[PDB]
Homo-oligomer: 67 residues x 2
């Protein structure tokens, strides 16, 4: 068996409020790149650019969102 | 319907983990079912553990992952 990178394209942002969850996968046997996949509240799955400052900012706003 | 949308998935959080142990992370912001953001790290060998999302070392780990491919 062989898996590969599942992102064809990476996007520069999504709206914070629309994120249901994100998965962040570092490089490994499957893929040389970190992949960040946002699942949005309508079911969409989107690949985000993990190096984009807005994407890192969104991630941070999520990590910090808890009360 | 499903358990993960009806309650938090975490029974407790850790302050850090060896980052090279991490195979992947899922990050879920709070919602009706859960007051906290949850960061579930699946470690090599398959165990899922939660990381405290406001631990500085855990935010630093996630930044390192995001920045792996920059020069």
């Amino acid at each position: 068996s062989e898996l590969r990178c599942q992102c064809l394209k990476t996007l520069p942002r999504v709206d914070f409020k629309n994120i249901q969850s994100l998965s962040v996968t570092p490089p490994g046997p499957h893929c040389a790149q970190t992949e960040v996949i946002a699942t949005l509240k309508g079911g969409q799955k989107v690949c985000l650019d993990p190096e984009a400052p807005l994407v890192q900012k969104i991630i941070q706003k999520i990590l910090n969102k808890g009360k």
